[PDB]
Design a protein around this ligand. Sequence first.
Ligand SMILES: *Cc1c(COP(=O)(O)O)cnc(C)c1O
Ligand SMILES: *Cc1c(COP(=O)(O)O)cnc(C)c1O
Ligand SMILES: *Cc1c(COP(=O)(O)O)cnc(C)c1O
Ligand SMILES: *Cc1c(COP(=O)(O)O)cnc(C)c1O
Lengths: 455, 455, 463, 455
Amino acid sequence: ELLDSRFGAKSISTIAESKRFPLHEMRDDVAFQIINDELYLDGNARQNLATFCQTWDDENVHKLMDLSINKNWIDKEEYPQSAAIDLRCVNMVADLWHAPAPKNGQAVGTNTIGSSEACMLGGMAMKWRWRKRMEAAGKPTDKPNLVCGPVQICWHKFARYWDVELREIPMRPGQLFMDPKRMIEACDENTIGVVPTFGVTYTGNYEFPQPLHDALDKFQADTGIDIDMHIDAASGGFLAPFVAPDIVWDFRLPRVKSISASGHKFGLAPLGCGWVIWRDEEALPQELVFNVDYLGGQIGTFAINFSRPAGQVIAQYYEFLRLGREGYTKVQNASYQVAAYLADEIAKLGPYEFICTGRPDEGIPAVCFKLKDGEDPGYTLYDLSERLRLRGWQVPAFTLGGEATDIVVMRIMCRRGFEMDFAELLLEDYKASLKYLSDHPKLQGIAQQNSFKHT
Amino acid sequence: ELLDSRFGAKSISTIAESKRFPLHEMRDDVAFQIINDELYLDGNARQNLATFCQTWDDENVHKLMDLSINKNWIDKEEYPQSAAIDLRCVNMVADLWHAPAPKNGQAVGTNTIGSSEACMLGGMAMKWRWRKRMEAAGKPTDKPNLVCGPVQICWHKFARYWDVELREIPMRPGQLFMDPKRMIEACDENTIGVVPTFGVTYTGNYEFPQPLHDALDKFQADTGIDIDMHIDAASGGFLAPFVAPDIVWDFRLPRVKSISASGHKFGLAPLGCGWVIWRDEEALPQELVFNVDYLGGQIGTFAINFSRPAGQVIAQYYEFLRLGREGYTKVQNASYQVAAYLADEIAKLGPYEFICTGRPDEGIPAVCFKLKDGEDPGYTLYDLSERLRLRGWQVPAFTLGGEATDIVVMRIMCRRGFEMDFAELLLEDYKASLKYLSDHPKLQGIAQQNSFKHT
Amino acid sequence: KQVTDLRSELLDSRFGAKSISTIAESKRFPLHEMRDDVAFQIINDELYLDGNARQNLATFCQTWDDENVHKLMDLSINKNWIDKEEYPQSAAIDLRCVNMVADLWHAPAPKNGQAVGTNTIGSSEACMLGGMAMKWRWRKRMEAAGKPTDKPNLVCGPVQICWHKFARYWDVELREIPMRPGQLFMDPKRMIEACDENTIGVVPTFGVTYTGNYEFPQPLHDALDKFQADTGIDIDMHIDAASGGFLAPFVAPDIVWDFRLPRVKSISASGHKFGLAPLGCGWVIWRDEEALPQELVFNVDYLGGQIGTFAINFSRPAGQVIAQYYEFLRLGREGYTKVQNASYQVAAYLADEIAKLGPYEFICTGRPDEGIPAVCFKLKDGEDPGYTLYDLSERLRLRGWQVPAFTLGGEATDIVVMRIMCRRGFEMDFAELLLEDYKASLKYLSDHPKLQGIAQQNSFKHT
Amino acid sequence: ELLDSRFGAKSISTIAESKRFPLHEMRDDVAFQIINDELYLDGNARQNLATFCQTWDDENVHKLMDLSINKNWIDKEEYPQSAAIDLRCVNMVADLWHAPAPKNGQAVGTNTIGSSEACMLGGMAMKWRWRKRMEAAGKPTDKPNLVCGPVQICWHKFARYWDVELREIPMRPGQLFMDPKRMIEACDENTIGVVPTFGVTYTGNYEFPQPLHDALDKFQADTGIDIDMHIDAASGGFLAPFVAPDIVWDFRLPRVKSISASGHKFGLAPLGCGWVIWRDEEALPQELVFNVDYLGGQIGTFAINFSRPAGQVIAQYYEFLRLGREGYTKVQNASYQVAAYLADEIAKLGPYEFICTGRPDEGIPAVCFKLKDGEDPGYTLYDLSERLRLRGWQVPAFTLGGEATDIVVMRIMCRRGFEMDFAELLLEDYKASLKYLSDHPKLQGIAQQNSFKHT
Ligand SMILES: *Cc1c(COP(=O)(O)O)cnc(C)c1O
Ligand SMILES: *Cc1c(COP(=O)(O)O)cnc(C)c1O
Ligand SMILES: *Cc1c(COP(=O)(O)O)cnc(C)c1O
Ligand SMILES: *Cc1c(COP(=O)(O)O)cnc(C)c1O
């Protein structure tokens, strides 16, 4: 019966006998080749403008990852040097965010797999601080709520997974984020804390912690209710410090007790890297820290994951070391330049409304636009997305949350390796698409599938 | 002024300015070299018998991991084929654990970073399942407890972070594990479930689910109280199915609603891979599952992390494809023969009483022993542990938990790579140590430091 | 009543097939073939048992990996050094090194364009070549004089073991000036005493293996000149510059030790020590044509005329010469100075810092004008700080560091020293880490008094 | 002014500033490329039929040699595993040559850089053995001699360096080797030993040690004088034990007290590896062995070299383990079948007389032939040799020593990698050279340069 043209031998079908555990062994390199070949069906992401996550390859990151394939992060004993490098990073990130100079030399924070993990960790201490304070006073502590904006999905999880009532201030037309006013309306003694999104996923815009900080101070005076903040700087955290160092959002704000960020977003780390830093020893409840015994003393951890590769910490460190402040500033500005240029060029092409023009002071390096209300140029942005996909380009169109469920937007993400010249290409394909849509009016209204929007 | 003999130029110390974010850029290949050089301080782990995790390099895994560096586990859209390989592995693991053949062709479960995340996930599902049952019966739900043996630390965490009373049945002399009787005294209507550890971290013994299962059956008959189980098969999950298949521990038992294991332990997968499988649709409360829109429809995920590499999943598949049931049976067998050899040989070298002798029907491939009571051979197992460390071997000695807190043990872990030849090297260095310790009596009692134990 | 499913043969977990032991029948020559990749993987796997040497502070030899050196070595795996015909370009490179090394040591300008000297495997080969050369030069001078040649002797200081061998193998009587407290080196006075009409030569060691100090050839050279005026005995030197040989000419070029001294007839050194050559490279250079007795040089025929060799080894790889040429070429005078300086800066820092932590007396504080980049110290006399240097070495080993504590020779058999060697790739950052581990160790020994005096094994001291 | 076309920079010449030590730095890659480029002027040896040494590249060997570039043979302490391997080899080789089973489980021998060092060692042991014995009898030990045959240059070296009178028995027409009768005549009380060369460099025939052994037995019966042997098995050492094991040449013969061989000749190791084995303990004088101290005991070495790579020993081991007896037999026979084929075919091409035709029982895989006396086919072997070179082939013609100064031979060496297909091509170029010389009668007797002949 069946032969394979690669091997010149009897066929082994990954798609049959994929319902059960395999019975027999297979020659090693044959297994390797079968799998390798089917990976060619994966995209490479170079033409993907939806994703936040690092997609550019650096030959040096590959080597570091490869050496670190078995280095256990949780094993501080066998891999003391990796452990050291980790602790360094914790500090360097702490510093980048203006955390108070730490007491003994070592800042209160931890590496994580991503911002998802950093956030629940952020959330758990937030809930714990609120709880303790609340038992102290002698009041019920069974109904905690969290106040926030158009948060990324992980916050919704935390909410459910931790039994916290989520008051997400709903998106609405010409009022897309958490403003002072609607925040204060959602706060009372049962609020564990307020979570501004420093770099909203859906739109790219910054939520500005400073106006929000003011309203929480006035709140305290008025009601004697003290409220903390946690900044989800999933992408913000490695942009602002460099391209807008005078946006005050970080630890410079006394209410911020912790900040998290994805290193594998604008932090230039490979996939698998996240950070969270607490203001000081006191932001982090001791009941959450578990001290594990090892050979030269005992290190306490607050983390969900246990064993895992230390590869990404080493990489993150390598980016940190090679670039520095000076170097990050050049990288991030390169991207803002591309975003900005795309924003200026895309306005010329249709009747668009910009939620985000890719400006260092308003948000991350991303262009995000919607069709001007009740204007009809002969196509939806879904339709336009589709023509562009026929050109290799993943540019997502979708609907926003809240009360702006109505609105369809397009969002372009300018990450590292999307240089000016590709930008150029995109625009040539972008125009080609308008022209084709123009010449075939029947193409209007047909596509309607929301794309992957969450990272 | 300071210079470096690698680079014959101005010194760049990573230990100076290691507390703040660096200002200036560095040549990319110097930064790489600086970090590469400092990783040689890390152990290669080949002589470490403390860890459970994979440390054997295989060129084909290295290659797969390297291709997979930017592949996003959470992005089913752009990496449609990794998405596929992940779904197969879920299926294949379900099968391995005797999951009821899945109704629509896809088993209920999910990849994870490790058992840590897989156990919380399972724990969460326990807590919700129980809640929903009490609510229905109109009863209070404020005091949930979990009943278990000498569990790996990850469970202490679960209890803490999710407000569950952990009834850890205490280790005691001649009574090291969770027995049916002590298990029953700890149970009540608030018990969200029982967790046997099918491969105890501290000693290597299996807690056999079957006797405990009987006890719960009798308990339900007596009280009306229906208690579920989740098996912590961290190591046991990829051992018994192959070398001891008629130990009845898995979904063959009606109460076991979910199983978890480490891919990076005896799963043979590289660091950062774990599995959890649920019996059927009803073991997973829907409220826990979050739906993400993409282009080809929408997928539901129950998972703490978000973005993270697909490398591991793919490597874990390669393992499955290349080995099969046949393959793994031989691989696990090889380990068991070594531990057995070691336990049989070591029993001759001193007054030792074994808690674990590395037999496939008792536990994982590990040797675990303590000094006989009232016998004094002229050294403690800490003393021996240090002599060994001088000849490169990491053979941990530590003390047990609960009421066994008195007991010092030494535990030798046998994993892939640790072949009979090396076990021979180890025996020689063992004997040489016993001899030096014998000629140098003064050394007795000096070392007293607990080694990293939890994995 | 059973539950397992087991196979009745030893299995390997790597290959999922029958076990094959390296330990069983490693006592006879193997009978059967094995799959190549399996043989490779078995051997490679048991090489992870070797140290990587990065925290070895005992050894002199080069241990830092450079990607370019790996590639030259790999290209040269089959390049036979002795085959001047097939590898003529390897042959010219080798010649270029000899010239360069002569220039570096102030050998008088070669009359025909080529210096007198040869590459070797290491200093060992070099010194015996040097010693045969010395022995023969003497021999001839005495038969001319019609005096007996059957009782030769050699006069030197605390030499490296290789001179003990030379002396044994070649029936030369060894007059080793013994070591002794506050006089650890072959001084003018004592040298003179051992010398008579049977002394083939004097061997000063430019950079001592045991401590790291230079014996300074100049003062010994003056003693010898004075010795000739008195007795009429004309005595030659050969300098064992095993490590000094690539240090001083860059960081202390006014220390006069080389061919600027007329009694120096040959110098040897190890390329794979401070030469920055990978393992397997040495050099001996002769002052000139007359320094090398014609009877030692064997003339081999090859296609483009005939070359003469003075070597113990024959067939062997040109990998190291090529690599050592690369070093020479990329670094140059400008560069070696920098590289070498870096290392001296590490020794100097280690010494200044280590002094602060206990009752030590330093034999060698790693200073460009006194010796190589090495710290050597002993415990002060009649002082007990609560450990011996042996014990400290053992706690230190427990953190990965191999820092040798051993006894010295001659009459300082009584004295125990610790010796740190700073070589390329042991940078200031590491030094730091060592220090932190050294303090830790002190603190551990302090809290554990019973530990004192138990350890007494000598470490490998010889390179 | 002057520029380099490779780097579009100022020229840097290696033939200029290569009279004195360079003054300046140079970029690391530029140096690399400069040297690397000139190495293409070196030949690859694939077409060189002069050399005995290993020239065939195997990918597995490259990798091991590259792992061991820093691994110090003399540093038993830092590289314990290499030390173990090195020792295994001494045993394996010992076994191979039928040494008596060693007392304490470790044969008396050592790895060397080559046969040359290996003979020097054997050499000194011979002189010492004789010195000791003669002192014991109260006799003069100032006039030692060595009896031997057409030795390789290392013995001429040994005789000079260590003041021994070399009594070489000279080759002469019709008798090219040390025979029993001329052996006996050169022997006396001052003979430190006899050295038969087990595979003569200049012709490829074996000197057969047995009928010499007889002569030494008969000699001792008559005179009372006892003479020992050392076999120079540079090449034959790793041929005979596989293709012709009942040639009695090794430790079977009681008077053999040491044997030496080149690994990098027929023992298949890369350049830089030799072996010398002693019959037992007593074969090796204790004054020759130096005892270094190290941390886990003390090892006595006997060797001229100190620090050097262990790369080749590890390589040599790899060749032993992967090939075994069965493998080597196959390997070497293939070399002989080429040799045997060349001899038969060359024969058909003109008026030659053979000294050696590549038979397993007479010598090594080598063809060696001279012109028939008083015949003139129209060229000298020197002239043939030159044409052969124009077609890329190194095939040495040269004269023999002593009394055969009159005889010019060609010697073809058949080593691993010179397979049947290349034999064929050689012939096709041999045939054409002969036709050219035929057509150009003027070329005759012009060339007259001896080739490198010594290995
Ligand atoms: C992408 C995103 C996340 C998810 O973070 P991961 O690193 O992908 O786990 C969380 N918060 C925000 C604001 C995001 O944009
Ligand atoms: C090691 C271990 C764990 C932790 O697993 P990771 O895969 O390292 O997250 C959990 N449970 C048990 C029983 C273990 O042995
Ligand atoms: C290292 C050393 C030697 C031996 O050199 P090798 O190249 O290792 O043979 C000789 N003399 C001195 C002074 C040494 O330090
Ligand atoms: C080449 C050769 C030698 C020399 O040994 P090397 O391995 O080249 O150092 C000695 N004897 C014979 C017969 C040889 O052919």
